[PDB]
Amino acid sequence: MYTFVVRDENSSVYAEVSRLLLATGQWKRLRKDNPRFNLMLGERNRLPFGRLGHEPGLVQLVNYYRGADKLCRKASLVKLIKTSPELSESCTWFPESYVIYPTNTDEREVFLAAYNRRREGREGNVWIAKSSEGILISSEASELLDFIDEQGQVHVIQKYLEKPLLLEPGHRKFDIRSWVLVDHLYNIYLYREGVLRTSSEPYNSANFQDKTCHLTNHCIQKEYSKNYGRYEEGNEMFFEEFNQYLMDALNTTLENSILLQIKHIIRSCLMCIEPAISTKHLHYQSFQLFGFDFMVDEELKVWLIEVNGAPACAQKLYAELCQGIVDVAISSVFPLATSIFIKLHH
Amino acid sequence: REIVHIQAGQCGNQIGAKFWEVISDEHGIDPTGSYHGDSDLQLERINVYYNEATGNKYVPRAILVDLEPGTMDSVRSGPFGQIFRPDNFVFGQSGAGNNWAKGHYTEGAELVDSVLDVVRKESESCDCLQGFQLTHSLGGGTGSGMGTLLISKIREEYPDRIMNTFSVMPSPKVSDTVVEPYNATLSVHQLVENTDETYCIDNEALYDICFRTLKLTTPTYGDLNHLVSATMSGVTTCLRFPGQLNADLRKLAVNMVPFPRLHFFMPGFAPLTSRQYRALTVPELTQQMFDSKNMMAACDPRHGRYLTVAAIFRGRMSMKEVDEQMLNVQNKNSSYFVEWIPNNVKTAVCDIPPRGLKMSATFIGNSTAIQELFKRISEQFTAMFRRKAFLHWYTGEGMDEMEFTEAESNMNDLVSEYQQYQDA
Amino acid sequence: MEVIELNKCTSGQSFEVILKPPSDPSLEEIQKKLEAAEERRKYQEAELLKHLAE
Amino acid sequence: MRECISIHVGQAGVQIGNACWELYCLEHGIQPDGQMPSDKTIGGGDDSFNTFFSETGAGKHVPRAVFVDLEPTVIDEVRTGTYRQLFHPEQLITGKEDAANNYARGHYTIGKEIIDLVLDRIRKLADQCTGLQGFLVFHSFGGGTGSGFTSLLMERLSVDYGKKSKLEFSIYPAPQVSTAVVEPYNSILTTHTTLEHSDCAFMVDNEAIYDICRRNLDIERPTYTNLNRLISQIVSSITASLRFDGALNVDLTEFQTNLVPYPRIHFPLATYAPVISAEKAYHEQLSVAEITNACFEPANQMVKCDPRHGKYMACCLLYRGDVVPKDVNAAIATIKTKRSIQFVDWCPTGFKVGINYQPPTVVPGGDLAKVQRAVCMLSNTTAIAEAWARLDHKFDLMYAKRAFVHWYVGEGMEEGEFSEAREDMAALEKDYEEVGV
Ligand SMILES: Nc1nc2c(ncn2[C@@H]2O[C@H](COP(=O)(O)OP(=O)(O)OP(=O)(O)O)[C@@H](O)[C@H]2O)c(=O)[nH]1
Ligand SMILES: Nc1nc2c(ncn2[C@@H]2O[C@H](COP(=O)(O)OP(=O)(O)O)[C@@H](O)[C@H]2O)c(=O)[nH]1
Ligand SMILES: COc1ccc(N(C)c2nc(Cl)nc3cccc(F)c23)cc1
Ligand SMILES: [Ca+2]
Ligand SMILES: [Cl-]
Ligand SMILES: [Mg+2]
Ligand SMILES: [Mg+2]
C-alpha cells in the first residue's frame, strides 16, 4: 500500500489525480507534512527538493522536475534557446525574442539594432511584449519600453506573428495547447488530444490596442469578448474537428501540416535540458506534466511561444489525461495489484 | 556504568527474585554465584548488575526491603535465595496492612534509614554508579508507600543519578484490597515527580494476556510474574549486554522522554510464552511486538500516538530483515508516530536469546495512550473518594484528605498533559 | 582551456587547468560562560533540595 | 616541514581515527610497533610523513594524535588493540561517564573539567613541533561528546593557538545508523558554536557512506567498521598532500586558500571513485575518464545532493595511481561538454589537480578492492546546503514543541542558545542561497 501527500490544493489536474489514487484502495493520503510518503504532489513555489529521497525504506517520487523552470518562465526560455547549441540563435521555430529589464543582462541595445533594420527594410514590424494582464502589442518601440518600465519585472519582447492561420468561418486566431508528460525514465509522452483555444472575434490587423482578436486566453474571451461560444462550446476546438477542417479547407492532415513540427519542437526542448534535470541516477525521482503552447502561421509553420510547467487541462479531457498520468507516471514506479500517449523518440 | 537494584514489599520482592533468576541464568551465573557459562559476551558488562566477590563470585547489587518478613524469608528459601548478600536483607516486623500511609509516614519511616545505609554502602563500592532501579507494586503498602518514600530519599542523597522503576499497577481483576486505587494514586503523584523513567506493568494486562491468549483459566501470580520477568530481561538487555549501542539508564531517559513528566513507558513482548516449537519469523516478531495484545499496560495504542519507541530483538537473525520490518511498521502506520519527533523509533539487536526461545522482541513505547491507564485509576479512586470511603485507615496514620485531593489533581494533570500531545 | 603552474616530482605532479576567467572570544569570556551554566545548575539543584526538605 | 596534530573526539572521532591511522601506517610502511625501515634518518628528520609522525631515539614513529572521549570503553579498545604500541598512553584521554547524547552535558557539565587536561596534553604534543601549522579534528555532529566537547575544544584552540589552522572531519547524522533522537539539536548547536573557529570542514553524511557500502560493496547491513574503512580512504586521499612530496595542498592554509573563498561557506563536498568490492571476481579496471566522470554522480558524494542546481566556488581533483595530466585534461574537456558545471561569476571556471603515482593502499582483508587509479574530488558547491536544509527542518520540528529541551536546560544551558544557533543556521542557509541562485 502506497502513500502520497498533497501540497498544491489549487491544482485541478492533481486534485483529480488524488481522487483516482484513493479510489484504487492501494493509495492512502497522509498529512501535507508527514515525510513518510511514496509520492509528493508538490507546491508550485519553493518545492523542497533537497528533502526528498532521504527516507530509508521509501522510494520517493515527485510530480516536478527541479530545473524545469528554465524552460517554463519566459525570459528563462529565451535565454535557454539563444545560448544552447542544440537550439541556437538560428532556431527556426522560435520567434525572435529579447530580454528587457525595467528602468529600476539586458538586451534592448541589441533589440533596437534589429528593430530598426526591420523598420527600414519596410517589413511588418509588430512586436509583442510580456513577462510571467499587462500585455502590449505595438508597432514602434518607444511604446513597448515605455510600458515595460511602468511595471517592475523582467520582460521579454518578441516578433509578433503578423500572418497567422485564420479559421473560417470567422477569420479568427487560435493557439494549440499540447500536453506532454515526462516520466521518471525521461520518456516523453505527448497526449493524443490537443486543444485549439480560439478567439471569437475576426482578426483585425489595424489597431493593436484591442486584445480580443490577438490574444487567445480562455479568460479574456469569456469576459471581454462579444460572442464567446458561437462556433465551439467554450471557445475550444478539439483535434478531430480541426483535422476535418484542414482536410476539407486546406487538403492536408493535422499530423502532416502541424503535428510533425510539434513533436520535433517538444522533443528538441526536452532533450536539450535532459542532462540538467534528469533523475536517472538520483536518490529521488521526478515526473512532470507540461503544457506546450503553439501558434501556426498561414503557411502551416508551427511556432512555440510558451511552455507552462503547471498546466490545467480541458474539462472534457481531465479524466482520460489524469488516468494516463496515474498509469504511466505513478503506477510505473508503484505497481498496483492502447495508450493515450504518443512516445517521442528519434 | 553500575546499577543499584532495590525491591520492596511482597510484589517487589517476588518479581525482583524472578528477575534475578532469569538474568542470572542469561549471564551464566548459578545460584551460588559461580560463573559457569561458556561465551564471554556474558561477562563483558556483568558488573552493571553484579559485584565481584572473593573467589570469583558474583553477588547481585540488590537490596531487599519489606516491613514483614514473610516474603523475604520466602526469597531466602527460594531457588536463587543464597545469591544475595545477607546483609542486604532489610526488614521490619509489623507489616504495612496494604496502607500507603503506614509505608510512607509511620511504619516505613521507622525502617527507611537502615535501607539507605545499605544503599550507601553499595553505592560507595561503585566506580561510576549510573542510578537505581526499583521493583514494587503500587497498590499494597510497603512497595507503594515505603518505596516512594525511599525514592524521594534516594533522590535527596543522589540528585544527579537516574531513578528507574518497574511499577505494577493494580487491577480489580487481580485485587487484594479495595483501597488499592487510593494507594496507586498517591504513588503515581510520587513517581511523576521523582523518577526519570517508569515501566508501567499493568496487572490488568498481565491477567488478560494469561487468560485470553495463553489460555490459562485461573492465572496465578506465578503466571503473571513469568510475563514480568520476560519483560524485565528484555527491557534491560541493552544495559547488560555489549552491543553496537552502548546503552545506559541516562541515554534511555534522554531519548525516550521529551518532557520530564511524561516518562511512563508501555512495555511489550513477543512471542507470548506460558510456563513453543515453531520458530517465529522476523515479520511475525515485529507484528506481534507492536500488537495491543502483547503489551503489559492495558491500553489501546491506536487510541493515542507514539512519542518515542525503542525495540530490542534477541536472537540470531537478519539485521537487514529487522530494519526492513521496523521501517515497514512505521511507514504503514505513520499516523501513529508523532511527526514532530523525527525518527523516533530506534532498534537494537542482541545475539543472545532468552532462555527457551530462538528469537524474541521486546517493545518499549512512550505512548499518549498510557493516559488510559491513569484514567482507569482515577475513576476507581473517585468512586470511593467522593463518599470519603475507607479514608479512616489513612487519617488514622496522620494523613489529611487534602493530600488525597492533591494527588488526584496531579494525576488528572498528567492525563491532561498526555492528551495535549495526542492532538499536537 | 590552458594548463598552468605544472610542478612535478618523483611522487607525482600537480597543475591548474583554467576553462574560463572570472565573469573570537577570549579565555576570560569562555570561563565566564562555563561558570554561568554551573551557577544555573547549582541553583536548580538548590531548588530541588529545598523542595525535598519541605 | 610543518607539523599537523590530529584530535579525535567521541566515539565516531576515535573509531575513524583508528581507521585513518591504520591506513597511514600501511601507506608509509610503518609497522604496528612504530618502526619504519625505509626511514634512514633515525631519531628525527623533516620528511613529509613527519608532519603526522614524530620519531623516538629508538626508531619508533608516533602519530601526532590525541584521542579524547568522555567515557572509557572505546579508547580502551585502542589501548588494547593492534596499534597499542603506536600511541603513547598520555595521548589517549578518557572520562568516567559520557555526555549522554546531550550537547550541553558535553560542552558545559562534563566538558568544563576535562578541558584543561586535554589542552595540557595537546600542548605536550605542540611543544614537540618546530613549526606547528594546526589541527585536524574528527568528531560526529550527533554525539554529546562529539558535538559539545568538540565545540568547547575548538573555542579554546582558537584562544591558545590563534594563528593556527583548524580543519574538521565531521560525521553528519543519519537515521539508518544514528544512536539518538536528539542528533539534530546537537548538530545545529555544535555547528553554530564552531563555525567561526573552523577554517575548512569536510562533512560526511553517514547516509551516503551507508548507501555506497550497500550498492558498491554489496554489504547487506554495513557496520561502523565498513563505513570507517571507506571514510578513511577518503580522509587519506584528502591528507595525502600533507604526508607526501607534492606542490598542491601542502599546508593547512592552502586548503582554505584553494577551497574556501568565503570563510563562512567552508564545507567542501567530497566525491570519491571508484569503490569496488574485494569479492568482485572479474573487474574491468576503470579509466581516468570513467573515474573523473564518476566524480559528478551524486551517488558517489560524501553527502547526497545535486550540484547541478548549485554553483561552484572551487574544485580540486586528487588522483592516486596511474594518472598523467593529459588524460585528466581530456576527461575534463569531455566532461565539461556533457555536464552542468556552473561556477559563480567572480570565480574562474577551473580545476586544481594533484596526482600521486602510488595507487590507493587497501587494508588487507577489508572490503575494498585494489585499483590502478582512483580520484577524490573536493568541490565547494552551494548544493551542500541541502544538507543544512534537511538538518534545520528536523530541528524546527522538535524545537517547535520544545521536545527534549529540558534535558539541555537542566545542564545549565539556556533556551536562548537553541534559537541563537538556529538563527545562525538560517543566516548560513541564506548565504548559500544568494551565493548560488
Ligand atoms: N561513520 C561513523 N559514525 C559513527 C561512528 N560512531 C558513531 N557514529 C555516529 O555518531 C553519532 C553518535 O555520536 P557518537 O560519537 O557515537 O557519540 P559521542 O561523541 O561518543 O558522545 P556520547 O556517547 O553522547 O558521549 C551517530 O550519528 C552515529 O551513527 C563510527 O564509528 N563511524
Ligand atoms: N503482578 C504481580 N502483582 C502482585 C504480586 N503480589 C502482589 N501483587 C499486586 O500488588 C498489590 C498488593 O501489594 P503488595 O506488594 O502485596 O503489598 P506490599 O508488600 O505492602 O507492598 C496488589 O495489586 C496485588 O495484585 C505479584 O507477585 N505479581
Ligand atoms: C529515539 O529513541 C531512542 C530510544 C532508546 C535509545 N537508547 C538509548 C536505548 N537504550 C536502551 Cl537502555 N535500550 C534500548 C533498546 C532498543 C533501542 C534503543 F535505542 C535503546 C535511543 C533512542
Ligand atoms: Ca626519520
Ligand atoms: Cl598561534
Ligand atoms: Mg499483599
Ligand atoms: Mg560515547
Side-chain angles (χ1 to χ4, degrees), chain A residues 1-142 144-162 164-346, chain B residues 1-55 57-424, chain C, chain D residues 1-95 97-437:
Chain A
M1 186 136 182
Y2 308 117
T3 55
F4 72 101
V5 305
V6 167
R7 295 167 67 94
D8 185 17
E9 304 274 4
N10 274 341
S11 173
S12 25
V13 154
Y14 287 109
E16 171 75 3
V17 157
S18 324
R19 304 177 210 120
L20 296 303
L21 284 176
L22 296 161
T24 69
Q26 318 203 36
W27 281 88
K28 63 159 317 158
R29 172 172 173 173
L30 321 169
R31 180 66 299 211
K32 72 154 273 215
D33 296 340
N34 185 4
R36 301 185 168 278
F37 56 85
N38 291 109
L39 160 60
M40 186 210 261
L41 306 184
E43 57 264 54
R44 278 184 46 180
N45 186 24
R46 320 273 290 101
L47 194 160
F49 293 106
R51 306 211 303 265
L52 300 172
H54 301 276
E55 277 310 319
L58 283 190
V59 178
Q60 278 181 334
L61 174 76
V62 66
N63 68 335
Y64 280 93
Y65 268 97
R66 185 181 194 190
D69 55 285
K70 260 86 199 153
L71 204 72
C72 297
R73 277 104 146 131
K74 274 165 216 343
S76 279
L77 154 70
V78 165
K79 197 54 198 157
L80 181 98
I81 274 174
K82 267 142 128 174
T83 36
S84 280
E86 298 69 20
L87 321 180
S88 82
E89 312 226 42
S90 40
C91 201
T92 88
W93 41 258
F94 189 69
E96 184 152 1
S97 313
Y98 302 93
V99 53
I100 293 329
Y101 288 71
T103 174
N104 276 55
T105 36
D106 195 288
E107 270 197 303
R108 100 175 63 182
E109 289 168 313
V110 162
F111 182 4
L112 295 188
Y115 176 104
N116 271 102
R117 228 290 199 281
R118 280 239 156 199
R119 190 215 61 121
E120 292 168 313
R122 288 258 91 217
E123 324 194 23
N125 204 65
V126 193
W127 292 71
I128 193 191
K130 189 176 185 240
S131 95
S132 100
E133 309 113 316
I135 320 86
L136 187 64
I137 319 180
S138 156
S139 151
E140 79 165 47
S142 283
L144 309 168
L145 315 106
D146 199 349
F147 174 60
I148 294 197
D149 304 309
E150 178 163 67
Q151 270 78 8
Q153 151 168 117
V154 191
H155 264 272
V156 65
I157 77 187
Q158 95 173 129
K159 187 41 206 89
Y160 190 71
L161 294 180
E162 272 150 22
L165 185 74
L166 301 183
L167 285 162
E168 306 290 1
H171 203 79
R172 58 224 168 95
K173 192 192 234 214
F174 70 96
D175 76 292
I176 294 180
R177 167 52 75 64
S178 293
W179 287 285
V180 187
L181 181 60
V182 188
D183 71 8
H184 64 296
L185 304 179
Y186 220 85
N187 292 315
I188 296 134
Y189 293 108
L190 174 65
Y191 182 29
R192 65 168 47 151
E193 303 294 336
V195 71
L196 259 77
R197 279 109 49 101
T198 166
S199 68
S200 196
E201 311 271 42
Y203 180 78
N204 184 275
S205 151
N207 239 10
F208 290 129
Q209 286 78 62
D210 75 317
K211 24 198 172 174
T212 317
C213 82
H214 292 287
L215 294 50
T216 83
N217 306 21
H218 198 296
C219 75
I220 298 190
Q221 297 262 158
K222 196 191 314 309
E223 302 272 313
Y224 300 170
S225 161
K226 182 185 162 234
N227 49 45
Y228 164 84
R230 197 231 283 235
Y231 313 72
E232 41 268 348
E233 151 168 27
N235 263 191
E236 281 180 356
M237 200 221 301
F238 290 147
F239 260 21
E240 204 218 302
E241 177 162 335
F242 181 46
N243 183 63
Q244 199 62 272
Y245 165 81
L246 287 169
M247 272 178 150
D248 299 332
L250 269 297
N251 199 40
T252 325
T253 82
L254 173 54
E255 164 65 33
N256 283 33
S257 42
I258 290 151
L259 248 44
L260 227 62
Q261 283 163 99
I262 282 158
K263 298 188 293 194
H264 178 258
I265 310 194
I266 295 176
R267 234 194 83 233
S268 291
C269 290
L270 289 176
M271 281 339 205
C272 174
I273 55 167
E274 171 166 17
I277 66 162
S278 157
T279 70
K280 196 215 191 180
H281 289 314
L282 217 46
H283 42 283
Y284 72 83
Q285 304 245 60
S286 280
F287 66 87
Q288 191 167 342
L289 175 75
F290 297 90
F292 280 81
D293 286 342
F294 295 105
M295 218 199 328
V296 193
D297 73 0
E298 65 186 9
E299 271 172 301
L300 287 180
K301 205 226 201 155
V302 177
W303 304 81
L304 169 84
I305 37 181
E306 90 170 329
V307 198
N308 169 260
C313 195
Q315 222 59 61
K316 182 181 162 202
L317 313 172
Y318 268 81
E320 199 184 26
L321 179 48
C322 294
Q323 177 59 227
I325 296 172
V326 166
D327 285 331
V328 185
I330 304 191
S331 293
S332 50
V333 178
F334 311 110
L336 301 161
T338 48
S339 266
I340 62 105
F341 299 107
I342 277 278
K343 177 152 126 79
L344 305 189
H345 51 259
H346 223 72
Chain B
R1 183 215 208 142
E2 294 107 341
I3 292 176
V4 168
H5 161 99
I6 304 160
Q7 39 194 77
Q10 180 173 211
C11 176
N13 274 276
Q14 265 149 205
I15 71 172
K18 271 282 291 144
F19 169 76
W20 285 101
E21 304 180 3
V22 165
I23 77 155
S24 279
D25 178 75
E26 278 186 24
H27 284 262
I29 306 179
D30 77 337
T32 71
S34 266
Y35 175 66
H36 265 319
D38 64 340
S39 169
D40 268 356
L41 278 140
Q42 286 169 343
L43 287 176
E44 192 149 355
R45 292 165 105 196
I46 201 56
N47 56 110
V48 172
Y49 279 105
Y50 300 74
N51 278 321
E52 206 152 348
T54 19
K57 276 310 217 252
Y58 290 100
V59 194
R61 184 163 326 102
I63 301 146
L64 307 79
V65 172
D66 214 341
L67 287 169
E68 68 187 13
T71 309
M72 311 252 300
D73 284 11
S74 214
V75 168
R76 231 179 265 110
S77 95
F80 270 68
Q82 255 88 33
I83 181 46
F84 309 99
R85 56 160 324 161
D87 282 6
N88 277 31
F89 296 75
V90 187
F91 47 91
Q93 292 286 344
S94 62
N98 291 302
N99 192 328
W100 195 86
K102 298 195 173 181
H104 200 84
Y105 288 134
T106 56
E107 313 287 343
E110 177 162 11
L111 188 64
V112 80
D113 278 351
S114 38
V115 174
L116 284 170
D117 289 339
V118 180
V119 170
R120 194 172 307 104
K121 190 200 82 224
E122 283 287 353
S123 99
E124 58 193 9
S125 309
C126 293
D127 173 57
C128 197
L129 165 92
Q130 36 172 319
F132 316 83
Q133 50 171 61
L134 166 84
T135 57
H136 66 150
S137 74
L138 301 199
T142 298
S144 63
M146 185 189 182
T148 56
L149 176 76
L150 269 171
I151 281 159
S152 81
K153 297 265 181 191
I154 297 189
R155 183 166 190 202
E156 178 174 50
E157 230 192 287
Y158 309 86
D160 60 351
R161 297 336 192 160
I162 288 315
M163 182 44 76
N164 166 240
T165 70
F166 301 77
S167 299
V168 177
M169 320 284 326
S171 180
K173 325 181 160 188
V174 186
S175 174
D176 287 350
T177 72
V178 294
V179 287
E180 286 164 359
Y182 283 160
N183 296 330
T185 301
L186 294 163
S187 280
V188 161
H189 187 9
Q190 295 291 311
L191 294 181
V192 190
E193 308 283 328
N194 303 321
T195 66
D196 300 303
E197 35 201 3
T198 280
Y199 293 100
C200 306
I201 298 164
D202 197 333
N203 257 0
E204 200 153 291
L206 307 181
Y207 180 87
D208 289 341
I209 288 170
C210 284
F211 180 55
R212 317 180 163 154
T213 89
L214 307 202
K215 309 319 226 173
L216 299 179
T217 38
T218 315
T220 66
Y221 281 128
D223 299 312
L224 295 203
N225 296 343
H226 155 86
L227 292 177
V228 168
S229 59
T231 295
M232 271 162 94
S233 152
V235 301
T236 69
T237 164
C238 290
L239 295 177
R240 59 220 166 70
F241 280 114
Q244 293 266 84
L245 183 80
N246 193 286
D248 66 36
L249 277 183
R250 185 179 306 283
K251 274 130 120 195
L252 176 78
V254 168
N255 288 291
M256 288 297 283
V257 184
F259 307 98
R261 277 153 65 76
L262 318 183
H263 58 266
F264 294 88
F265 301 159
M266 188 177 305
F269 181 85
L272 288 166
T273 169
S274 155
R275 235 153 65 251
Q276 189 209 358
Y277 305 118
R278 204 260 284 253
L280 257 76
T281 78
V282 168
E284 304 187 300
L285 220 49
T286 295
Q287 173 258 332
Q288 263 168 260
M289 74 173 335
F290 267 98
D291 204 333
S292 100
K293 282 200 279 262
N294 294 55
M295 273 156 212
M296 321 272 119
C299 302
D300 191 351
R302 293 191 182 262
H303 290 177
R305 306 234 282 159
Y306 281 111
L307 300 174
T308 54
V309 182
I312 305 76
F313 291 78
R314 316 259 318 252
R316 319 228 317 290
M317 70 206 93
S318 159
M319 200 147 330
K320 187 206 174 93
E321 217 170 294
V322 169
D323 281 341
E324 305 170 350
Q325 281 315 302
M326 288 312 291
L327 289 168
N328 174 272
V329 171
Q330 308 165 66
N331 285 351
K332 291 271 142 282
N333 308 281
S334 71
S335 198
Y336 297 100
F337 300 84
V338 304
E339 70 282 353
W340 40 271
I341 303 186
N343 318 109
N344 67 350
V345 182
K346 297 263 149 274
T347 306
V349 167
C350 183
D351 282 353
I352 299 147
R355 172 105 272 151
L357 290 172
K358 280 193 235 74
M359 298 182 316
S360 67
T362 301
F363 172 91
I364 309 182
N366 186 352
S367 165
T368 65
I370 197 75
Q371 86 171 269
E372 282 180 345
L373 201 159
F374 301 113
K375 287 175 128 243
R376 217 188 57 224
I377 305 304
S378 192
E379 280 160 45
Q380 296 164 7
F381 178 100
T382 287
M384 311 200 265
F385 189 64
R386 57 178 180 182
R387 301 291 281 275
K388 259 76 209 151
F390 303 98
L391 230 43
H392 72 100
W393 301 119
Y394 299 86
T395 62
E397 302 302 301
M399 274 175 90
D400 208 279
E401 298 179 2
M402 198 58 42
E403 184 162 351
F404 278 67
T405 303
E406 268 145 19
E408 174 191 49
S409 279
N410 199 16
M411 191 156 84
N412 284 344
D413 286 347
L414 178 75
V415 161
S416 294
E417 291 151 38
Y418 276 121
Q419 181 75 334
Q420 155 166 37
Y421 298 109
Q422 179 165 311
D423 301 339
Chain C
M1 163 153 157
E2 69 150 29
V3 158
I4 55 138
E5 283 286 29
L6 179 49
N7 169 266
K8 106 196 186 52
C9 81
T10 84
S11 322
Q13 35 199 299
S14 40
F15 58 92
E16 191 163 3
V17 191
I18 302 197
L19 289 179
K20 201 243 162 150
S23 171
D24 296 2
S26 86
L27 177 38
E28 186 76 335
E29 306 136 274
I30 288 324
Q31 312 231 258
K32 190 150 136 183
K33 281 318 82 193
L34 263 43
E35 289 177 346
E38 189 181 28
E39 287 337 296
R40 292 188 285 302
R41 251 193 335 271
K42 289 214 136 283
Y43 176 82
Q44 316 163 162
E45 174 142 319
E47 284 298 274
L48 187 269
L49 282 191
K50 280 158 173 313
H51 181 79
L52 287 196
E54 277 172 340
Chain D
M1 185 289 284
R2 321 199 55 219
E3 297 92 342
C4 283
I5 296 178
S6 290
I7 302 169
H8 312 277
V9 180
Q11 176 178 118
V14 166
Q15 300 192 140
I16 290 163
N18 265 316
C20 296
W21 284 99
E22 176 182 41
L23 204 49
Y24 294 167
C25 292
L26 287 178
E27 293 181 0
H28 305 256
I30 306 173
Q31 304 258 15
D33 45 358
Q35 302 273 309
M36 187 190 13
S38 32
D39 188 12
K40 311 309 181 181
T41 85
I42 291 201
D46 55 356
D47 289 343
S48 269
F49 66 84
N50 278 13
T51 63
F52 278 46
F53 297 81
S54 64
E55 306 180 38
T56 59
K60 197 206 199 73
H61 304 85
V62 181
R64 302 201 194 260
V66 155
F67 292 65
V68 61
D69 203 0
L70 295 181
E71 52 102 357
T73 41
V74 168
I75 278 154
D76 282 336
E77 290 209 269
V78 194
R79 315 172 149 136
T80 63
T82 317
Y83 295 90
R84 43 208 143 111
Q85 318 183 232
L86 209 82
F87 305 93
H88 179 305
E90 47 212 83
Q91 330 162 250
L92 315 176
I93 322 185
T94 86
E97 40 182 29
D98 70 36
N101 306 161
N102 192 343
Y103 171 90
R105 200 177 168 85
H107 188 83
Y108 295 103
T109 305
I110 297 203
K112 171 163 164 352
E113 63 198 3
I114 207 184
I115 179 58
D116 295 323
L117 166 90
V118 168
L119 289 183
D120 172 84
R121 306 282 246 260
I122 283 156
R123 174 150 306 302
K124 308 271 135 272
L125 282 192
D127 286 352
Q128 281 270 102
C129 294
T130 67
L132 175 82
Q133 41 170 334
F135 307 99
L136 298 83
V137 188
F138 303 69
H139 64 100
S140 64
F141 277 1
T145 304
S147 71
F149 184 69
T150 291
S151 76
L152 181 57
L153 178 52
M154 291 292 281
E155 272 184 337
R156 272 298 264 297
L157 287 183
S158 290
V159 151
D160 293 16
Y161 302 82
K163 281 231 99 163
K164 281 48 164 64
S165 282
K166 297 195 278 303
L167 265 68
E168 286 183 275
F169 296 92
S170 293
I171 303 308
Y172 173 112
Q176 272 147 304
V177 297
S178 78
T179 69
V181 75
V182 292
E183 289 188 35
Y185 280 169
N186 300 339
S187 294
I188 298 322
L189 289 176
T190 201
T191 291
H192 155 79
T193 292
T194 310
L195 209 40
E196 273 272 76
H197 301 264
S198 195
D199 308 306
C200 185
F202 300 107
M203 266 208 290
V204 178
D205 188 340
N206 264 349
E207 175 191 69
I209 303 303
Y210 195 81
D211 259 287
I212 289 160
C213 277
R214 286 204 281 160
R215 287 175 349 235
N216 303 342
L217 295 180
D218 317 319
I219 317 177
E220 281 186 60
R221 213 298 191 167
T223 60
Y224 284 141
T225 316
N226 306 137
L227 301 183
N228 288 345
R229 291 209 262 227
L230 174 56
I231 291 171
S232 87
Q233 287 286 321
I234 281 76
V235 168
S236 168
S237 172
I238 295 172
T239 68
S241 55
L242 299 161
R243 304 143 40 222
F244 290 106
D245 206 5
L248 177 64
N249 296 339
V250 285
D251 61 28
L252 299 176
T253 322
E254 213 183 335
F255 282 87
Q256 173 260 107
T257 294
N258 296 341
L259 293 170
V260 189
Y262 282 133
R264 259 168 84 82
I265 291 183
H266 60 246
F267 302 94
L269 182 70
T271 321
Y272 186 83
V275 170
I276 304 295
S277 165
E279 316 283 283
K280 234 214 182 152
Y282 173 82
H283 180 54
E284 290 165 13
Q285 291 292 312
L286 298 198
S287 66
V288 164
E290 293 172 309
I291 71 173
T292 308
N293 191 41
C295 286
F296 295 87
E297 233 56 64
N300 304 312
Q301 294 156 189
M302 293 309 96
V303 189
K304 287 188 198 175
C305 56
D306 199 343
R308 294 175 298 175
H309 305 106
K311 298 215 191 117
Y312 289 89
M313 280 150 287
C315 193
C316 283
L317 272 39
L318 309 170
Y319 296 89
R320 304 176 85 151
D322 175 48
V323 186
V324 293
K326 74 166 137 313
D327 288 338
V328 175
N329 291 327
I332 297 178
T334 180
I335 279 167
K336 191 85 217 330
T337 74
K338 293 176 146 212
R339 290 220 190 253
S340 314
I341 296 146
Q342 269 278 327
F343 271 67
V344 295
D345 279 347
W346 34 286
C347 279
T349 306
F351 298 76
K352 282 185 172 83
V353 179
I355 288 171
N356 183 296
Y357 301 127
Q358 185 193 357
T361 300
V362 292
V363 201
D367 311 289
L368 298 191
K370 316 161 221 334
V371 307
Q372 281 134 36
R373 55 202 66 83
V375 58
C376 179
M377 177 165 95
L378 305 180
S379 57
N380 196 339
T381 165
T382 54
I384 206 167
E386 291 175 32
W388 299 130
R390 290 156 55 210
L391 214 51
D392 287 336
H393 182 74
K394 282 181 194 309
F395 176 112
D396 286 339
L397 290 173
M398 289 201 283
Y399 193 74
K401 304 303 154 114
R402 298 315 180 272
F404 303 97
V405 170
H406 71 276
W407 288 115
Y408 296 74
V409 172
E411 295 287 355
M413 205 177 115
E414 280 150 30
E415 208 181 80
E417 185 158 1
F418 270 89
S419 51
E420 227 158 301
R422 184 62 178 91
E423 220 92 73
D424 200 0
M425 307 287 325
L428 197 67
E429 279 210 64
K430 266 303 262 152
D431 297 341
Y432 273 102
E433 186 147 54
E434 43 110 353
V435 160
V437 192

